Every structure is written in structure tokens, then in C-alpha cells.
Amino acid sequence: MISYDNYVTILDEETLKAWIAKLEKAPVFAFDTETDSLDNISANLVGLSFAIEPGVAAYIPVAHDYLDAPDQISRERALELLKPLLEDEKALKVGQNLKYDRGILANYGIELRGIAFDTMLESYILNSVAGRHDMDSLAERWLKHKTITFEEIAGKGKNQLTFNQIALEEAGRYAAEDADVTLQLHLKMWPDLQKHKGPLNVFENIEMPLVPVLSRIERNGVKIDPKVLHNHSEELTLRLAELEKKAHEIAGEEFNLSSTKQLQTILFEKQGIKPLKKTPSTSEEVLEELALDYPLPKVILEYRGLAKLKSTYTDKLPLMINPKTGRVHTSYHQAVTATGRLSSTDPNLQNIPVRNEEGRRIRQAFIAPEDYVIVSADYSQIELRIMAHLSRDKGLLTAFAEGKDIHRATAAEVFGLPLETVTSEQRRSAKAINFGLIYGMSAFGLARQLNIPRKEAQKYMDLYFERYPGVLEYMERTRAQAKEQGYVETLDGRRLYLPDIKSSNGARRAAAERAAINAPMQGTAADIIKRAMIAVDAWLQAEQPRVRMIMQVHDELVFEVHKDDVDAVAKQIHQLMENCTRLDVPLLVEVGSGENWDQAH
Ligand SMILES: [Mg+2]
Ligand SMILES: [Zn+2]
Ligand SMILES: [Zn+2]
Ligand SMILES: [Zn+2]
Ligand SMILES: [Zn+2]
């Protein structure tokens, strides 16, 4: 176990000051905060823990208020004595998910500096796919130590206690162990993170500096109009009713809009071909093939889609508005994706349909406050530009260089015809090839996206590789080093380990080869986006203009800018994004604005 003998519980100023003195001369120190809620903006700090050396850690309770809780240093007195140390950029701190801790302190007017090491990110940069990067998983992987779980001291279910309700000593065991373990994890991982300059570079200049900027974006939140979302909800109810009637009217009787049950009994029973369509799906959608002529499958297609969107965003979004700020605070995850891109939840901004009309209405609900406007800064087809650079292809490089539409430029080369005459179908064919290459799509998978026969798709890809030889080379070379060293890297050095590259399993090894071609372009896009965020945030902090960075979704950064400042600010965001990141890839940033996210998008 871990008893009350392990760590000290600081209940007096004199002892706290003794520790602050030791903390001041430590080379690095682990630090952690305890609160009464996972919600950063409204959580209250219940206590703090520190670790100066493996096995030497302490817990300082400041707001435990259960019946008869012992005297504790007051939250205000503890923070004023600790403030200088916390705000000192020279005092280096180590922590697990420091983004959270930085925010809690910000609730009390404290600016946490010296945010040097985050064990979550150390683990993530070492090997993004090694497993989960949370402390409990980390302590077990690297230290063969099983940590005290929050459930162990607080309980489970609705009757679960909040930190302020837990006994001082019990809270101490948990909090001081976090600090201690975090320091031990750093001592084991930091030395390893130096065996390679690639990962070390990404960790030091991309991931760590991004920690406080993610905190600031999350805490800023985004303005959502609940009325608009409600109208959209009422209207969708009516549209779902109408659509259901249109389905019944086309055939007979009533039925659910569920395939492999009520649909096959209608659809193919009235002429068609037996198999159904899985909601596997992004490759063989039987329902949308029939949709080009057959009416029923087209209405069932649209019905399901609207049903999904209503319960996911229309009904959910209004419930996420924080009472304290009046805004929605999404959760960004910095150590979850395999390629290094940021993910998002509650809400998952990336699942809002882009090329769909309803998704546009969801976006219209993201509004700018009075006298402000929503500004969108996007990296135009960054992955494609990255592939152009990685393949060193003069053809692609020149297309982007002279500002031509790469999809029409590619079609003009593949099909051999003037750029002005390329048709929509030809452009659509080249476009499917271009994005297919990024995901390492098979010549048959391209046929399923283009609806053309196999070997006809193969005919296009051979014509493509002949016109753009540099792309085949990159593809072959990347699969090469992937087998030679078990991993692939981005331009900045970020690595994706591929354990199934020599799998001996067929499909399992195919996946690893696709990931081999894909990761370098996706990871590089990710690195670029993170560098722009740090650069834009740095300008924001230094110059203090009337602008907030509110979102990050796909390849765009969304802001709130004062209406009278839009022009100067747009010039600035634009320069920072395509000139203060990587100077090797030919980058283009498209900046737009409006009353809501949809207008600026
Ligand atoms: Mg191309
Ligand atoms: Zn923590
Ligand atoms: Zn903790
Ligand atoms: Zn993208
Ligand atoms: Zn420019």
C-alpha cells in the first residue's frame, strides 16, 4: 500500500515556507493541483501537492470542508506564499497534464510559468501508440507501480465524493503520490527522450509550448446561440416526420428506416439487387448508388443523416453551455491521435459535416459577441502541398507555385488536355486520386470511390505515376524505411511506430503500410498547425490586440476579432501562419470573416 507515513500533510505556514525554500533550489520539481470538479472554469482548488525528490512529496489541503475538518492554511494565504514560485519562469515544473493545472491557477489570477515537462507528452512523443498516456497506465508501464485511483478515495456512481469531502490524510496519500510518481516518470523518460534529436525537437518546441495555449483556447470557450439550435431542432422534427411519410407513400404500410430488417423487404422486393448497405460504409454504399435514379433509398439516406445530426449537435450543444461563462468549452486532447493531430470532444468539432447543408446550419450557431466578428484562417490543402514537397515533384510544385487548382492541373496532365478545358468529371477523377495517395488507397479502393471498374482505376494511377514519378518514389522509399527501422517521421522529427510492418499477417500488414505513407503528411500538417498556434498565441500575449483564438478544427484556426480591427488583424494572422512556421513547404492561408462560423468558413 501507501500509508500516511509516506508523505507529509502541511497544515501550517512555517512548514509550507520550509518547503517553498527547498522547492526554490531544486533543479526541477513535480507539482499537482486537486479540485472539486473536472470542469476547469468552475472548479475550486481544494489542495496542492509537490515532490522535490523521489519519495519526498507533500500535500497542502486548503479547502476541505467536511464536518469537523481540521484547520488548514487558507486557500488565499497558501496561494500568495506560493505565487512567486509558480509565476517564476526559471523555476522548472514537471506535471501530468499541466494544461489542467495551469487553468486552475488562472482562476486565481496566477500565471503558471516554467511549464517545462509534462509526463503525458513525454510518453506521447516517445511512442504515440505504446498505449494510454494517463498516469495510472504510465506508472504501471515504466515503474511497475499501481497508483491509487480516484475511485479508491472518492467512490463510484452518483454518490461519489468531491475532493473537498475526502479526509485530509486520504486525500494526501492520493495527491502526494501523483506528484511523486510524476517526478519518477520524468526521471525515467526524460533521459530516453534525448537518444534522438527528432522527438526531442517536437517535444521541446511544439508540444510543450502548446500546453498553455490549449488551456487558453479551452478557457476562452465559444459563443453558441441556443435559440438558433432550438429552431433547427423543431424544424428537423418536422422534416423527419415529412421524410417518414414520403417513405411510406413511395411503398405501402409503415416500417422503420432500419436496413437488413424493413428495407430489404421493400427495396429489392420491388426490384433491385439483394445485398444491403452498412451504416465497409465509405466504400460500398448500396443506398446511394440507387439514389441516382431510385427515390426510396434516397429519402432513407437523408432521413438517417438528419436523425444522427439532431441528437448529436442540435439537442446536445445547448446543454453544454457553461452557466458561469455562458459559453461552450470544448476539450482538446493533445496525446491521443497516432499521427500527432489534435482531437476534440464535448463537442467533437471535427464530426460536424463540412460539405453538407445541415452542417452549415450547425456552424451558423457559433456566433461572435456584440461588436466582434468570427474570423477563419485555413491552410488550403496543406497535406497535398506537403506531399508535393516530400515527393520533390516539379510538376506538383509548379502547379501550386503558379496558383493553379491542383485537381484540374493533375487532370490536365493525367488525361492530357488543356487546363481551361478540363471537365468536372475529370477534375473529380484526379481529386479522388490525389487524396487517395495520401491515405495510401489501393487501385481498387479508388474504383469504389469513383464508381469506375477495376483496372480502369489502375489505368488512371499508372498514368498518374508516369506523369508524377516523384510520388511513386516517395511512396516506395517510405515503405522502405518503415520496414528498415519500424517507424516513419514527419518533417519536424515526430515518429509513428509501425509494429505490424513485417506482421506476417496480410491485412494487418497492409494497414501498417498505408499508415507508413499517410503519417508523414498528416503528422507534418499537425506539426505545422501547432507551430502556427504557438506563433499566433505569442503575438496575442505580447501585443494584447482585441482578438481571442477560440477553436482549432482540421486545418483551420477560428478567432473572435473586433469589428473595427478586422483588416489589420487579418493581415497579421495571415503572415504569422504562412511565414512563421515551416519555410520549406509551399503554404497558403485563406482568411475569411462573418457574423458566425459558417459565414467566415
Ligand atoms: Mg497529385
Ligand atoms: Zn494532475
Ligand atoms: Zn492529483
Ligand atoms: Zn486537412
Ligand atoms: Zn500570403
Swiss-Prot record:
Keyword terms of this UniProt record: DNA damage, DNA repair, DNA replication, DNA-binding, DNA-directed DNA polymerase, Exonuclease, Hydrolase, Nuclease, Nucleotidyltransferase, Transferase
Top-rank lineage group of the source organism: Bacteria
Disulfide bonds: none
Example of a GO cellular component annotation carried by this entry: cytosol
Enzyme class name: transferase
GO biological process: base-excision repair; DNA repair; DNA replication; DNA-templated DNA replication; double-strand break repair
Enzyme Commission no: 2.7.7.7
Catalytic reactions on record: DNA(n) + a 2'-deoxyribonucleoside 5'-triphosphate = DNA(n+1) + diphosphate
Region (Polymerase) residue spans: 198-601
Keyword check for Transport: no
Any one GO molecular function term: DNA binding
Domain 3'-5' exonuclease: 1-194
Oligomeric and partner information: Single-chain monomer with multiple functions.
UniProt record similarity statement: Belongs to the DNA polymerase type-A family.
Function statement: In addition to polymerase activity, this DNA polymerase exhibits 3'-5' and 5'-3' exonuclease activity. It is able to utilize nicked circular duplex DNA as a template and can unwind the parental DNA strand from its template. Genetic interactions among priB, dam, lexA, nagC, polA, rdgB, rdgB, rep and uup link the PriA-PriB replication restart pathway to DNA double-strand break repair.
Protein name: DNA polymerase I
Source lineage: Bacteria, Pseudomonadati, Pseudomonadota, Gammaproteobacteria, Enterobacterales
Gene encoding the protein: polA
Residues included from the entire protein: 324 to 928 of 928
